[PDB]
Design a protein around this ligand. Structure first.
Ligand SMILES: O=c1cc[nH]c(=O)[nH]1
Ligand SMILES: O=c1cc[nH]c(=O)[nH]1
Ligand SMILES: [Cl-]
Ligand SMILES: [Cl-]
Ligand SMILES: [Cl-]
Ligand SMILES: [K+]
Ligand SMILES: [K+]
Lengths: 218, 218
């Protein structure tokens, strides 16, 4: 676990060694755009922007990727809602409940699942405004996700319109699924088969399925 | 069925209307390289290069794709061996035999199966030399396979090394699986569950299964 310093808040970024190859470019890129980010109140707060860089990558086989943090109360862990109030994670838990038979739970967290790294393409938004920092994270977003696709077997992105151009953006050889976002119109998410498809493709790729029930909190 | 003219042999390419949108570009790319390509004796003969363009695409939900034709005796139909002598198709048949329970058969052809189009990424080779014509087919190969992946639900490529970067070339929402080639050492093809898993993937995509037993000749 090393760290590097950046000129603007949060001033230091702690990271796992698996990220070493991109940290130099990340410092340079972040120093360029950070003033744009910090003039607004943000979700998450700046000290939590990069908290997922503490996660290893070599033991990951699925990236679960949303476009950017919750408009409010983002923790720096994508989808995480400590009090289980956010619609997105509740919808995800409901789907996993249906697939796993786990009916009694108090919460759900993608970040405690073996082999899964939850990710947000953009690492912040202006408080209460989705995708408001897209232009500023852009170069960093491509850099960091491309780095993740060097490790994982499956990239699962949520939001058909949000991720409309993801394949041209990454130019990756990795398996990529773009599914419905939890708030997609007409409850399309609950019929989405992506969690099942991911496991079929992993086992095809000679990897263990994801045990999605590990995400539950009791 | 319409046809177009090319400047060198086979001179006329007849095609089903489903291929209409790539034909002008095909003519242009083929005219650019045919003079160099036709320095060699080929598998298949030039009059059979394009015979699969006679197939419709709108009723196809799976493409089974090899790298290029048999080094000798290619017929223009990928994997096809009229006398059932070639190793690849014998291994394919054996795999489908175990999957289906069909024990007595005299041959197997991937081209007589409802919903399947068998394909070769490169449409010829120099006689007796595998992948020898990749230099000539390059642009055509991308053009044609990309068009197929706008119609099929699953793309099944044979050759882990040959197709390792294929999802970056296609940049497609199609579900692409890359499996072992029939002649993979330590008999890895025999362990491969791709043919079986194709129907699982199709079901998740709300499509009908393939009846792989239609491929048998008796
Ligand atoms: O972190 C989050 C939360 C909701 N939606 C996302 O895309 N990411
Ligand atoms: O047509 C063929 C024959 C052998 N191998 C392939 O990949 N395709
Ligand atoms: Cl969506
Ligand atoms: Cl063979
Ligand atoms: Cl192989
Ligand atoms: K969001
Ligand atoms: K071949």
């Amino acid at each position: 676990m090393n760290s590097v310093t950046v000129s603007h808040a949060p001033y230091t970024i702690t990271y796992h060694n698996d990220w070493e190859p991109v940290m130099s470019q990340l410092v340079e890129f972040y120093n360029e755009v950070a003033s744009w980010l910090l003039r607004d109140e943000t979700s998450p707060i700046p000290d939590k922007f990069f908290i997922q860089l503490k996660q290893p990558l070599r033991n990951k086989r699925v990236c679960v990727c949303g476009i950017d943090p919750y408009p409010k109360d983002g923790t720096g862990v994508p989808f995480e809602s400590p009090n289980f109030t956010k619609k997105s994670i509740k919808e995800i838990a409901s789907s996993i409940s249906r697939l796993t038979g786990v009916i009694d739970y108090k919460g759900y967290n993608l970040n405690i699942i073996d082999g899964v790294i939850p990710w947000n393409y953009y690492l912040s938004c202006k408080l209460g405004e989705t995708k408001s920092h897209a232009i500023y994270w852009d170069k960093i977003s491509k850099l960091l996700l491309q780095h993740i696709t060097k490790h994982v077997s499956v990239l699962y992105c949520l939001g058909k319109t949000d991720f409309s151009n993801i394949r041209a953006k990454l130019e990756s050889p990795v398996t990529t699924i773009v599914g419905y976002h939890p708030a997609a119109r007409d409850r399309q998410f609950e019929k989405d088969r992506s969690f099942e498809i991911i496991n079929v493709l992993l086992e095809l790729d000679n990897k263990a399925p994801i045990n999605w029930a590990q995400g539950f909190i009791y």
